[PDB]
Paper text:
The crystal structures of XaCas2 were determined to resolutions of 1.65 Å and 1.75 Å at 20 and 4 °C, respectively. Data collection and refinement statistics are summarized in Table I. The root mean square deviation (RMSD) of the Cα atomic positions between the two XaCas2 structures was only 0.07 Å, indicating that the two structures were essentially identical. We hereafter describe only the 20 °C structure, which was determined at a higher resolution. The asymmetric unit contained two XaCas2 protomers forming a single dimer with pseudo-two-fold symmetry, 175 water molecules, and three acetate ions. In our crystal structure, XaCas2 seemed to adopt a catalytically inactive conformational state, as was also true of several other subtype I-C [name] structures evaluated previously. In the XaCas2 dimer, the two conserved Asp8 residues were too far apart to allow them to coordinate a single catalytic metal ion together [Fig. 1(c)]. The distance between the side chains of the two Asp8 residues was 11.1 Å, and no metal ion was found near the residues. Strikingly, despite the high similarity in overall structure, the two XaCas2 protomers exhibited significant conformational heterogeneity within the putative hinge regions. Without these residues, the RMSD of the Cα atomic positions between the two XaCas2 protomers was only 0.3 Å, whereas the RMSD value for residues 72–78 was 3.5 Å. In protomer A, Lys74 formed salt bridges with Glu40 and interacted hydrophobically with Met2, whereas Trp75 was largely exposed to the solvent.
Numbering used by the authors:
A (entry chain B): 1 to 11, 14 to 85
B (entry chain A): 1 to 86
Write the structure that this text describes.
Amino acid sequence: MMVLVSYDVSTPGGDKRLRKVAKACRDLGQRVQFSVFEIEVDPAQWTALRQRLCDLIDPDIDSLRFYHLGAKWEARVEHVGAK
Amino acid sequence: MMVLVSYDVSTSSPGGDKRLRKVAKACRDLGQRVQFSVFEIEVDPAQWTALRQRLCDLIDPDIDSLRFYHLGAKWEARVEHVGAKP
């Protein structure tokens, strides 16, 4: 399943946390913007990755939002600008 | 319909703060700023067409990007928020 992961990381140690989040996502998705990831995971993998993401961020100052994009999500996404 | 707008604005170039401010202002009446640079827009198709044009015009596509996700209805996306709510 496709889960869109949007990471709003604070601007102290934030750069490291974004690096760690990107690394944790590397095998299971694509980093489509600086802090946005299109994650393709089955439910068990998502349980695992989600836990890691929760542990890697600082929930006091960062946030994560997760969106289930559904099937045929590729026809429902438009990119404008730099890649 | 819900459209999720993700704005990746350059930090290495000047005016990014202003461009993000203008994008947020354009999204203010039809949506919610759910993260620093992410907006949930609740729009009919004509409103979306109009807003999309403004957002495209407001960014610098050489150094910024926008991604627009058509979510259908918000409930279909089973959205979860973890962490801070500034």
